[PDB]
Amino acid sequence: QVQLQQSGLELVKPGASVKISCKTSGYTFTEYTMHWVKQSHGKSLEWIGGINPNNGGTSYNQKFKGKAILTVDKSSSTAYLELRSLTSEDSAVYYCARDDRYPAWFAYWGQGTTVTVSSTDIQLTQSPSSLSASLGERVSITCRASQDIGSNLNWLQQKPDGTIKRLIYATSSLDSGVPKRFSGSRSGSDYSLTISSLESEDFVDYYCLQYASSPPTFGGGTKLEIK
């Protein structure tokens, strides 16, 4: 099975640089773009950049240029993220994610690496940010796109341990193995994830992610809680 296995805690002093790894197995490393994503504690996600391991072609979110440098090592099937001149605001969890064939981008996710520093973009308005419901209920979570994103919208689920899994890609395509009670749809600018018949393991966090235009951007998240 596909595994993006990320390196361990970086607990480092201000000004230090670190180089985090994402060691892949279970697929051909060179065939697919690899992305990196930041998530500050308690907050939503931000795309840092992506790299084509076949040619080293690399696209950065403008706010991370000068901070993040992406490389790959084909010989070891490992993607790296180097973070330069670290400060407090860099303390966060960093994830790698790899695409599958378009439009199945952002298909598999690393488990995240914590970094602790101690001595024109499209907006997705995600609502509601918190939702209380009971077992067996049906709920919808919605993302409103600030500009047209076509069908390029994914739904991700994040568990309290921080692990991220894609549930839906290309608006309505259900990931293999994901329960059929999850479905994605679009009506106009509103993209929605509907979970029918809630089960207890569903009561976690959810994010939408658009990949129509660079930089990919994320909704602010929805926290699903049992009533």
Side-chain angles (χ1 to χ4, degrees), residues 149-188 190-220:
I149 61 171
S151 57
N152 300 310
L153 185 297
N154 289 346
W155 287 101
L156 307 176
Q157 183 190 59
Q158 181 177 52
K159 300 181 177 180
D161 69 356
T163 57
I164 294 170
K165 180 175 217 296
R166 185 180 68 195
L167 298 191
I168 302 295
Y169 61 101
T171 302
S172 58
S173 293
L174 184 67
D175 272 282
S176 49
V178 172
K180 289 181 169 175
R181 63 175 185 280
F182 296 84
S183 55
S185 64
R186 172 195 184 174
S187 301
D190 269 337
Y191 294 75
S192 301
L193 174 75
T194 303
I195 309 173
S196 68
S197 209
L198 287 163
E199 285 178 2
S200 45
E201 63 178 355
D202 297 336
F203 286 89
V204 292
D205 295 349
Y206 294 87
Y207 292 92
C208 58
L209 165 53
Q210 71 80 24
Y211 54 99
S213 168
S214 176
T217 46
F218 292 81

Side-chain angles (χ1 to χ4, degrees), residues 10-30 32-100 102-119 121-188 190-210:
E10 298 286 346
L11 171 62
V12 299
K13 293 181 180 303
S17 296
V18 300
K19 180 153 100 172
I20 299 324
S21 59
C22 172
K23 180 177 179 180
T24 75
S25 58
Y27 75 101
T28 305
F29 176 72
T30 52
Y32 303 95
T33 293
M34 179 72 71
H35 302 276
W36 290 84
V37 168
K38 178 184 184 184
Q39 184 173 37
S40 288
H41 305 303
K43 295 194 195 152
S44 176
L45 298 124
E46 300 175 84
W47 180 86
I48 296 169
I51 182 167
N52 177 344
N54 283 333
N55 57 34
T58 298
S59 180
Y60 292 90
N61 185 332
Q62 181 72 30
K63 77 170 279 198
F64 290 100
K65 285 184 191 176
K67 174 63 48 174
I69 296 186
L70 282 66
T71 58
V72 301
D73 177 352
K74 169 176 162 58
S75 83
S76 73
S77 292
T78 299
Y80 290 103
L81 167 67
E82 174 172 345
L83 290 177
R84 291 284 184 79
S85 188
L86 282 157
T87 72
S88 298
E89 284 169 292
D90 300 318
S91 292
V93 178
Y94 292 83
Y95 291 93
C96 53
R98 54 154 283 214
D99 293 335
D100 189 12
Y102 179 95
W105 282 2
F106 294 95
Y108 304 93
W109 289 70
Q111 84 282 10
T113 297
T114 294
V115 172
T116 297
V117 184
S118 171
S119 285
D121 296 353
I122 302 180
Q123 287 179 358
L124 296 175
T125 303
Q126 183 166 343
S127 58
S129 37
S130 59
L131 186 115
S132 202
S134 316
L135 305 173
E137 271 194 58
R138 179 183 164 258
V139 300
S140 287
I141 296 174
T142 299
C143 278
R144 195 163 280 172
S146 97
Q147 323 194 310
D148 180 34
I149 61 171
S151 57
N152 300 310
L153 185 297
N154 289 346
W155 287 101
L156 307 176
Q157 183 190 59
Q158 181 177 52
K159 300 181 177 180
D161 69 356
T163 57
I164 294 170
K165 180 175 217 296
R166 185 180 68 195
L167 298 191
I168 302 295
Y169 61 101
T171 302
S172 58
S173 293
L174 184 67
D175 272 282
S176 49
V178 172
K180 289 181 169 175
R181 63 175 185 280
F182 296 84
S183 55
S185 64
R186 172 195 184 174
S187 301
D190 269 337
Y191 294 75
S192 301
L193 174 75
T194 303
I195 309 173
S196 68
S197 209
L198 287 163
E199 285 178 2
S200 45
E201 63 178 355
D202 297 336
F203 286 89
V204 292
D205 295 349
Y206 294 87
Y207 292 92
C208 58
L209 165 53
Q210 71 80 24

